[PDB]
């Protein structure tokens, strides 16, 4: 005959943002040098 009223509640939760990324690239530039440290005719005496 005794009806008791009760109130229930569950705990809340917490989320968080995040990200993923594959490997990254970057540019590059090269110029080949053309040095010619060469004389005309060295008179050798080997």
């Amino acid at each position: 005959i005794r009806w008791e009223t009760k109130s229930c509640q569950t705990a809340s939760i917490a989320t968080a943002s995040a990200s993923a990324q594959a490997r990254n690239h970057v540019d590059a530039q090269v110029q080949t040098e053309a040095p010619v440290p060469v004389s005309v005719q060295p008179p050798s005496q080997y």
Binding site: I13, A14, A18, A20
Partner: protein
């Protein structure tokens, strides 16, 4: 399949389990969709749903996860993103 973890919000035991699970997945499955599916299902069974897995060589993501249930790591050249949300 050498593992390198880049980011995690996860217990150490689950981190190791994730790497071992993904490592087996790559040994067993050739196609990324099937690798991802295997990994996802193993976590739903052990760690409750709802898990999601992304497996690949070229992607970015922006996702929302439940605290303590996120990891992002590589196995060699393949990235695996594993998290719970929902």
């Amino acid at each position: 399949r050498k593992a390198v973890i880049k980011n995690a919000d996860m217990s150490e035991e689950m981190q190791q389990d994730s790497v071992e699970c993904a490592t087996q997945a790559l040994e067993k499955y050739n196609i990324e969709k099937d690798i991802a599916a295997h990994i996802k299902k193993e976590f739903d069974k052990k760690y409750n749903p709802t898990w999601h897995c992304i497996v690949g060589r070229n992607f970015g993501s922006y996702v929302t996860h439940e605290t303590k249930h996120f990891i992002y790591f590589y196995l060699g050249q393949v990235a695996i993103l594993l998290f719970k949300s929902g």
